[PDB]
Amino acid sequence: VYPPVPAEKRKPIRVLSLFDGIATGLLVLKDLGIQVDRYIASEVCEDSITVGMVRHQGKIMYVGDVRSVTQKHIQEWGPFDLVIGGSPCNDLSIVNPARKGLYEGTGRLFFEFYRLLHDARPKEGDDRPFFWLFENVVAMGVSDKRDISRFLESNPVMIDAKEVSAAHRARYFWGNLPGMNRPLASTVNDKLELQECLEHGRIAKFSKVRTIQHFPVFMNEKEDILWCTEMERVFGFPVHYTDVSNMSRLARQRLLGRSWSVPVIRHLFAPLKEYFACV
Amino acid sequence: RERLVYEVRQKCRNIEDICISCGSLNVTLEHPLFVGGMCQNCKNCFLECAYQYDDDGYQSYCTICCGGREVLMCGNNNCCRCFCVECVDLLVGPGAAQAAIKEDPWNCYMCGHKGTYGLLRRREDWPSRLQMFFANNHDQEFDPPKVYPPVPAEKRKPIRVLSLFDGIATGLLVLKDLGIQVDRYIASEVCEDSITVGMVRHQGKIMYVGDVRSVTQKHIQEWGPFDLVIGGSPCNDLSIVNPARKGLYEGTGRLFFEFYRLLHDARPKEGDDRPFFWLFENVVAMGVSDKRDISRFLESNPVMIDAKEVSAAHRARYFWGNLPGMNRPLASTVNDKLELQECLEHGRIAKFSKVRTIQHFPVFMNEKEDILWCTEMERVFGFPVHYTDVSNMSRLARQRLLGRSWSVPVIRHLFAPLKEYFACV
């Protein structure tokens, strides 16, 4: 536990964000009104790059693959105040029909986070505030979870988004952010019922959508999928967030599906306001 | 015309006494863009052909004669004109076309910086003459539309609209933007995506009908008196942009009459002097006898309105109707974006200032050639941001859906004096 820095002394936060996806982290930091000095992001999927580019207005400095980031890169891109990331979950999740393996691909990429975390960490005796967050799914192996806990040298917190959002999104969060254990509060802006997240003219038999009776909606006495803008509303994203480039619906749903739940991430990132500068 | 222009350059015949399109001696008009006379058959050809563009975004035929077998496309940015080899042999000289092919950065004669050549010289008020040229269509003489006296403000009531070929509910959207109270908005449409767009964006208010051909006069009577009937025939088959142009009169022409029928069904009787208004829309790249038959049946003179005046698209459209002030000039408000660049997303730069939609991919982003994004196509046509992102549809379909639609500030311009006849929010 690092002691709080006085308000006049606070500075803009610097974030290294691995497996950034659609820039949920920076978006949440903006929503909290924290000044962001810089936001370095590694990602490989072009659609997600584009989403971040447009929605965050060129501010994000885009890097390539995480495996091309050296310790020299970490040093020359300035000291980092917050390192965040979530390993690929599509291969760990049981939803993908082609489950060739779980430890392959995703597990290797985990260590990449691990490496860069140590690269971004201040030395002992440098008592400057430094924070990190790793995210993963709950449907994972026990020895896998143990090895992750061993390497990050911490105990996981399971947080389920149902407490604050209209999705069943149970996720592990390792990290040293203050108040990562405390209970989740749902603000009035958050929508605990699926029906509030639907478009007008639609009615939901479901109150929650399970995403980690396939088609959740009865509209005009017919069974339909949630629309992309509603999937955004379920996860807490701003309205029409992923409509940037010309991409197919299947891809755009997939893109939204991988992402972090916005009010959960707001809940986690909120006490960082006590350590950095405000807008 | 080779021997006749031989006598023209020998100072024995005036170029203004000869039809520079086909060499006819039956000179009635002057050519609107360049020096010479113009015969009536060439006027009909010019009406059909001038604003016809190929799939490359350049003109389908020569700009001069509206024919030509092999054409010269123009190098200058945003210019889409073509000049066939035959025309250049008279006006610039023999072999000038074959020599002009070899000039790799070439500018066409509407874009030439000098503006003055030997036999061909560009006439100075050509945009004014282009605007006058449609007023020059007095062959289809018709009586002026009946002007209805303004209803006092306290007496005004909410407008009722019958909207055929509604598409994505551009009309109701514009009426909302003008702040006119809408009692009801009956709409016929058949494409499910467009139905959905209207449903969501206009919040269940729209009462959806099926095919226009299932709407009877009894239907028209029992759905209450209508104050405004609007519509635009399918333009995809009339447009030269669709590769599969099987016909022009088939499909689209038949559906035109549907509008015609329901218009008469919705019209008040003589002696019923209640205000009533109607609008029909169509493309400029259409047949002359087609345009005549349309003018004959709607018993009116078309107004051509080009969206370039108020928006970032070349969208030249005919508007028949009796709305007051349909002839008056178009004003572009500060909210409207006359440059393509203002309509782009951040991080993108447009070499183009206008997009021609009636160098295929209009955008240089990160030193690469890309299509406009769907939300930008919405911004080009004046639609609200993220207007067509309702259901889960493909990009090709969603672009197509946007492409057919009416230009929003043009429709705002047309619908604006209806505020003097109906109730406000």
Ligand SMILES: Nc1ncnc2c1ncn2[C@@H]1O[C@H](CSCC[C@H](N)C(=O)O)[C@@H](O)[C@H]1O
């Ligand atoms: N080698 C690699 N380097 C960086 N990102 C990668 C990668 N391989 C896969 N990814 C990306 O890692 C992401 C994992 S899920 C990302 C969730 C993210 N927090 C969000 O809010 O969207 C995927 O988007 C995938 O595109």
Ligand SMILES: Nc1ncnc2c1ncn2[C@@H]1O[C@H](CSCC[C@H](N)C(=O)O)[C@@H](O)[C@H]1O
């Ligand atoms: N039989 C029919 N009845 C009603 N609409 C039809 C039809 N056949 C085709 N259409 C529709 O007519 C439209 C012509 S273009 C529509 C433009 C409209 N003003 C807009 O703003 O979108 C197309 O959307 C097409 O889907």
Ligand SMILES: [Zn+2]
């Ligand atoms: Zn002629």
Ligand SMILES: [Zn+2]
């Ligand atoms: Zn020609």
Ligand SMILES: [Zn+2]
């Ligand atoms: Zn030119």
